[PDB]
Amino acid sequence: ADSCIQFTRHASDVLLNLNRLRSRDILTDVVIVVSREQFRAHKTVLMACSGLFYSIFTDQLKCNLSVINLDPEINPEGFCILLDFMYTSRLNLREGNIMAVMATAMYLQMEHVVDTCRKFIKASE
Amino acid sequence: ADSCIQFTRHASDVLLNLNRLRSRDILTDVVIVVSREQFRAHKTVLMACSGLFYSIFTDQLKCNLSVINLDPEINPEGFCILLDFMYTSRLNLREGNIMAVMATAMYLQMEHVVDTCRKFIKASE
């Protein structure tokens, strides 16, 4: 119906609770391996945030894997920063990590993050 | 870090994608049965939105169930309206369904929905 009311804070409150489930390792169903660093997460949140994970977990064979190994060129810190962004909307972008975060966001197909990284780099050059 | 930037639309975009996964029945992991009406959903979204589901899916035995039966007094339409609200932040509250939606939200332990229902009922009396 077009007669619905809307709860402004609902989507952010849902994300806060999904992040609390992640911190407590509740119903996490995949481990992402980045250069021997392991990150536990929920497949649905990864798919909702990343074109790469959406492609992986909609594949009829890969949807059933409990471990996914990323390309060895991917920086674990860059991945960690992006995983935290997926679950909080907060991106910890710093001079010392921006190149790695942008390269990781390009690999993960996180369009808005790539765009902001490009703008912050352009401003410094 | 306290130096993070934030993406205003991120949480709502994540919820839009989780709802698209639900519509397409992608990685849904539980069926909620309400008076013989079946609703497929993601346990993590139900837990993030409802005190009742948070209690059910953190229980060491119930966390593994693929089917959950609700109390026979629960109205399927009321449940459907609340499940749609969980995934969209939009509540289809109408004169003809408000009593059922409020009773269902009380059972599901969805505090903000109960509060708004109470206010809309008080305004009509």
Binding site: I5, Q6, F7, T8, R9 | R90, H112
Partner: peptide
């Protein structure tokens, strides 16, 4: 909170 979207 609520609003008319």
């Amino acid at each position: 909170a609520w609003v008319i979207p």
